[PDB]
Structure formats: structure tokens, C-alpha cells
Amino acid sequence: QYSSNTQQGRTSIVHLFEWRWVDIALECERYLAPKGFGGVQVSPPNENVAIHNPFRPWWERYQPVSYKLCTRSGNEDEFRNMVTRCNNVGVRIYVDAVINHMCGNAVSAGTSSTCGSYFNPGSRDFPAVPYSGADFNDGKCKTGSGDIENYNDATQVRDCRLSGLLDLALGKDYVRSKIAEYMNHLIDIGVAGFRIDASKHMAPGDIKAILDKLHNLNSNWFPEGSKPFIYQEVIDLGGEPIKSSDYFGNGRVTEFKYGAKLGTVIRKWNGEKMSALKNWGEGAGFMPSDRALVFVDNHDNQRGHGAGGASILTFADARLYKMAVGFMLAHPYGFTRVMSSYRWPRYFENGKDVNDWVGPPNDNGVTKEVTINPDTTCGNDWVCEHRARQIRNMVNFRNVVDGQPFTNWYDNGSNQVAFGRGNRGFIVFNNDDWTFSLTLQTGLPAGTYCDVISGDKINGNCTGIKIYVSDDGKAHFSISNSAEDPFIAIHAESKL
Ligand SMILES: C[C@H]1O[C@H](O[C@H]2[C@H](O)[C@@H](O)[C@@H](O)O[C@@H]2CO)[C@H](O)[C@@H](O)[C@@H]1N[C@H]1C=C(CO)[C@@H](O[C@H]2O[C@H](CO)[C@@H](O)[C@H](O)[C@H]2O)[C@H](O)[C@H]1O
Ligand SMILES: [Ca+2]
Ligand SMILES: [Cl-]
């Protein structure tokens, strides 16, 4: 469960949040494959409640009605077409598996669902699965509301309803089997693994019992014996009885400490500074590198959901965000996931975004296609962070330096820092209020290198800054504190 199953030499996943299947398939062929992305996290592909108040929120996709593969992203044919096309160019698909719960207990009965399946939350009837009242935890939960009220009590966190979402009886072989049937459908189509949603709300042993029922990966694309990559969503910032480590038997675990701390450091909040990043990883209090799934922001916290946090960096803070993503992709800790977002009309009241529910760009609820502008950015209100030169080129940096040790660390005791990855890459950051102008040991072979933050190597020249490494490995760097992107990165494949 720990191996990503990516093609060799690909080290990151991108979350194409709410993208349609056909647009992901095109994106695999035209962009993700040639730019060396390892794979795509897709939104939940199973049928969900169509929620019309408010109007088609992104969160309706976390309210299952059945395991039919029919959503705003596309139908089963489109999903299959995408997985095949992406695998055929060596880009994997990872599914957001919503398996702790069905929909909200107060949702009205009927056929307001993305495939028109009937369901009746009040009677616990989901005939398209099928599930009935026997398959939920009504009798097991002991809280007055039936909902989760107190995270200090592990029992209710597992047995009661997360925000009123109907909680599946995961101790029952019947329920485990229906969930495994869904996941094996996806495996056989060609999916490479899963993000297990709401993992804190399931016992580690119930997750194990489901995973035990799963097939090996599709043997046309994956070697014999391959198991799905598993990464579990557990928000563990400390202080609770449930710990991220409780889930290590099953796969990797999201490290939510990572982006919270990195945001604080890059914002220079709470007396934090980049010089402290020399101890990044376990030295910062995080879980073991071989179990962490890391990221700067995710689809919940970029809009204040989940654990939220004022320090989280997102595309809305573009300059600091690119620097944070660059640092994450250059540093060896963890397995990296890059967010790819859409725009929505943020509007704050009482310190909170009252439009944090808004779903993807749409025409009367039908998701808009992703259009590509001449300059390779996206239209139709898709942000496409993964197409920004500074991020795209850092995804390649991570591939180029894969396996090389963290070395040649420099800091000025404040916010000017630099480090290398063996003899294959070097990166330099200026987050202080004055110019960073210094000759540094890079660990690289002598030559002229293109800075991949400002530009690209193409037909024997650079389109941005050039860095000149001498025979002794030293090179001069000059980065103004008012630079639009105040960091520089060079690597073995950007050498002229
Ligand atoms: C949104 C997250 O809520 C819970 O996180 C707790 C956390 O465990 C606790 O330590 C502390 O930090 O408070 C937070 C917030 O209460 C869950 O533990 C997380 O799993 C959860 N993230 C998840 C889960 C779901 C549910 O499938 C998704 O839901 C959202 O959709 C629901 C249902 O439609 C909406 O009602 C929510 O408002 C949405 O946030 C999340 O997107 C997914 O990532
Ligand atoms: Ca549960
Ligand atoms: Cl996540």
C-alpha cells in the first residue's frame, strides 16, 4: 500500500479538483505526461446527492447515494476512457474514496442524485447499493444528537455521524463487501490507488478489513503483485486520542502539520523564519517521511474548511504560495501532492467566507470544460496551478533529484536560505527585507544552468536567468527582496 505505482522517475500527484473526466484525459496526454507528473487525484467518482440549496456546492460530492460511476465529472464510459488514456501515457489515477458514510441524514428522500437513483435518508434506504437501516450505526452511537460532538472521545468519532452524514456499519462483513465491490470495480478499470476520505472516522482495523478484499492492480499496466497505493486523510495536529500513526498499517497518511507550519514560516508569522527549515521533516515534529503525504493546501483548507488555519497558503497569495510549493518540491521529505483549483467569489463576513460552498465553474450546474489559453494558462475560471512555470518546473526538479540527499545547506540566520540535492539540484530563497547577493557552494558540476523558476531551457539557450557554476561548484546568486519570484532553482537537466 506504500508504493505510489507511478512510472519510474515520476514523484508527484496533482489534485484536479472537480475536473471532468474528459478534460483529465486530454490533460494527461497533452501536458501531464510530457511534464513528468506521476498521477492525478480525482474527485469522488461515485453517485452523490444533487444539492440545490445552496446551488451545487463542491461538498455535495462527499454525500454518496450509490456506487454507480455517474457524477458531474462524467459517466462510467467517460471515467473508463480517462483511466485508460492516462495509463497509456504513464500517468496514474488515484480515487477519492468516500466510504465512511452515505449522505446527510436530513436530506430529502427522492431522486435528486447525479444518476437519478432513488434514496431515502430518513428511512436509511439506499436501494441502488443496496443498504438499509441494518447497515448504519444508529444503535451504536451514544451521543444525544447522533452526531459527533467531542473529538476527545474516540468512540464517538468512529461510531457517530460526521456533521450528520449517515455513518456506515464498517464492522459488518456485508458493508465491507459492498465497499470492496466498488473499489474493485475501480481497480479493474485501472486506478492506481486511493485517497481514503474521513479516515479518522473509521477504525484502522475496519479499513484493513476492506483493503484485505481488494484485487491486485490491473495486470495490463502494472507488474504482478502490485497493490493499490493508499493514503488516508487524518487531520492530526496533536491533542486528540486518535493519532496519524494509528493508520500506518494501511498506507501513507496526510500530514496536515506540514502546510500549517510551512505557511506560518513563509508568512514570517509567530517569530518563524526560513532558517529554521534546516530541520524540516521529522525534526519539525512531523511523522516519518516514508508515511507522509504532504501538500501546501488541500481542497478543504484553501477555503477554510477542515482544520482550516489562517496560515495556509493558496493561489490567493500567489507569490508566497509559489515559494512554499517550490520549497516542498525541492525538499526530500514526504510524497508530494500539488493542488489545482478553481476560482469562486470569496466574500467574508464575521471573519469567514460565506461563499466557501461554491462549486466548480458551471453553466446552470453543468461543469465548465477546461479551456487552454495561448500562453498555456486556463480559462473558464480554472486556476491550473499545476501549469504555472514555477510549479511545473519544480515538479520536474523533484523528479531529476529523486533519491539525492539534502545537503549544502546555507542560511543567514534569518530568511535567506539555500540547499542542494546531492549533485543534481540546488535551490536558493530570499524571504528577507533586503537583497540576497552571495556566492554559494551548489554541489553541481561546472557549467551554465537555466534558472527554472524564471524560465526554461530550449534549443540550447535559456529564456530566463542563467546561473554560472565554476569548477569548484560555487555560483553567484542575486535575488532582490522585491523580486516577483524571490527564489532560483537549477538542476542537472537545466544545464546547457
Ligand atoms: C472537513 C473535515 O472535517 C473533520 O475534520 C475535523 C478534524 O478531524 C478535527 O481534528 C478538527 O480539526 O476539526 C476538523 C473539522 O471539524 C473530518 O475529520 C475530516 O475528515 C473532514 N474532511 C473530509 C471529509 C469530508 C466528508 O466526506 C468532506 O466534506 C465536506 O463535505 C461535507 C459533507 O457534504 C460538508 O458538510 C463539509 O462542510 C465539507 O467540508 C471533506 O471535504 C473531506 O476532505
Ligand atoms: Ca464512522
Ligand atoms: Cl486530503
Cell of 117: 437513483
* Active-site annotation holds for 233: yes
Element (H, E) at 81: helix 76-88
Residue nearest to atom 28 of ligand 1 (CA): 62
Which cell goes with 267?
Answer: 508568512
In 3D, which of 202, 220, 221 has the Cα closest to residue 211? 202
For residues 57 and 496, what is the distance between their CA atoms, to the nearest angstrom?
48
387 vs 1, 43, 339, 373, CA distance in Å?
Answer: 29, 19, 11, 11
Residue with CA nearest ligand 1 atom 41: 300
Query: What type of residue sits at position 148?
Result: I
Ligand 1 binding pocket includes 18 (Cβ within 6 Å): no
457: β partners: 462
Cell of 362: 458551471
Among 232, 305, 355, which residue has the most ligand 1 atoms within 8 Å of its CB, making it the best to mutate?
Answer: 305
User: What's the one-letter identity of residue 258?
Assistant: Y
Residue 121 CA to residue 166 CA, distance in Å, equals 8
Pairwise CA distance, residues 250 & 320, whole Å: 34
Other beta carbons less than 10 A from residue 226's beta carbon: 18
- For residue 288, what is its C-alpha cell? 516519518
Residue that has been written with the C-alpha cell 539534502 in this structure? 406
Dist CA 193 CA 178 (whole Å):
18
Give φ, ψ of 237 to 5 degrees: -100, 10
Distance CA 153, CA 158 (A): 9
Indicate the SS3 state at residue 134: helix
Give the Cα separation of 43 and 300 in Å (integer): 13
Determine the distance separating the centroid of ligand 1 and the alpha carbon of 279, expressed in angstroms. Answer: 30
Domain positions in the chain: 2-403, 404-496
Tell me if residue 307 falls in helix, strand or coil: coil
Binding residues: 100, 158, 167, 195, 201, 298, 337
User: How is residue 165 written as a grid cell?
Assistant: 452524514
Cell of 383: 486556476
- CB-based contact 93:83 (threshold 8 Å): yes
Q: What are phi and psi of 124, to 5 degrees?
A: 65, 30
3-state secondary structure of 136: strand
> How remote is the CA of residue 41 from the centroid of ligand 3, in Å?
10
Binding residues for Ca(2+): 100, 158, 167, 201
Q: Classify burial at 402, counting beta carbons within 10 Å of its beta carbon; exposed 0-12, middle 13-18, buried 19 or more.
A: middle
C-alpha distances (whole Å) from 255 to each of 39, 272, 286 are 19, 19, 7
Q: Active site residue: 96, 233, 246, 300, which one? A: 233
Q: Which helix (H) or strand (E) holds 353?
A: strand 352-353
- Closest ligand, as measured to the CA of 337: 3
What is the total residue count of the chain? 496
- CA-to-CA separations, 489 to 63, 144, 319, in angstroms, rounded: 42, 56, 16
Closest CA to 73 of 33, 44, 107: 44
State the catalytic residue, choosing from 27, 78, 135, 197: 197
What is the enclosing helix (H) or strand (E) of 440?
Answer: strand 436-441
Q: How does DSSP classify residue 108? A: P
Query: Cα of 174 to ligand 3 centre, how many Å?
Result: 27
Residue 235 beta carbon below 6 angstroms from any ligand 1 atom? yes
Q: How many Å apart are CA 67 and CA 175, to the nearest integer? A: 12
The SS3 call for residue 104 is strand
Which region, left, alpha or beta, applies to residue 491 given φ > 0 means left and ψ of -120 to 50 means alpha?
beta
Separation of CA 147 and ligand 1 centre (Å): 13
Instruction: For residue 239, give the C-alpha cell.
Output: 491533542
402 catalytically annotated: no
Q: φ, ψ for residue 254 (rounded to 5)?
A: -60, 135
- Across 122-258, the runs of DSSP E, i.e. the strands, are 165-167, 193-196, 229-232, 252-254
Placement of cell 458551471 in the chain: 362
Which residue owns the Cα nearest ligand 1 atom 8?
Answer: 235
User: Rounded CA gap, 323 and 266, in Å?
Assistant: 8
**Measured between alpha carbons, how far is 243 from 201 in angstroms, rounded to an integer?**
12
Please tell me the distance from the alpha carbon of residue 43 to that of residue 18, in angstroms, as a whole number.
6
Cβ atoms 266, 413 nearer than 8 A = no
* Backbone phi and psi for residue 408, each to the nearest 5 degrees, phi listed first: 50, 40
Residue whose cell numbers read 497569495: 317
Of 193, 235, 262, 240, the residue nearest 38 (C-alpha)? 193
Q: Which of 250, 185, 191, 196 is nearest to 39 (CA)?
A: 191
The yes-or-no answer to whether 2-403 and 404-496 have a common fold is no
Nearest to 95 by CA among 174, 216, 189, 212: 189
User: What distance in Å separates the CA atoms of residue 486 and residue 479, rounded to the nearest whole number?
Assistant: 6
48 lines ligand 1 (CB under 6 A): no
Phi first, then psi: what are they for 136, rounded to 5°? Answer: -120, 165
Distance CA 25, CA 32 (A): 10
| Backbone phi, psi, residue 482, to 5° | -100, 10
Yes or no: say if 324 and 262 are a contact pair by the CB < 8 Å rule: yes
The secondary element (H helix, E strand) that includes residue 70 is none
The reply to whether CATH 3.20.20.80 applies to domain 2-403 is yes
**Cα(200) to centroid(ligand 2), Å:** 8
The CATH classification of domain 404-496, taken from the options 3.40.640.10, 2.60.40.1180, 3.10.25.10, 3.40.350.10: 2.60.40.1180
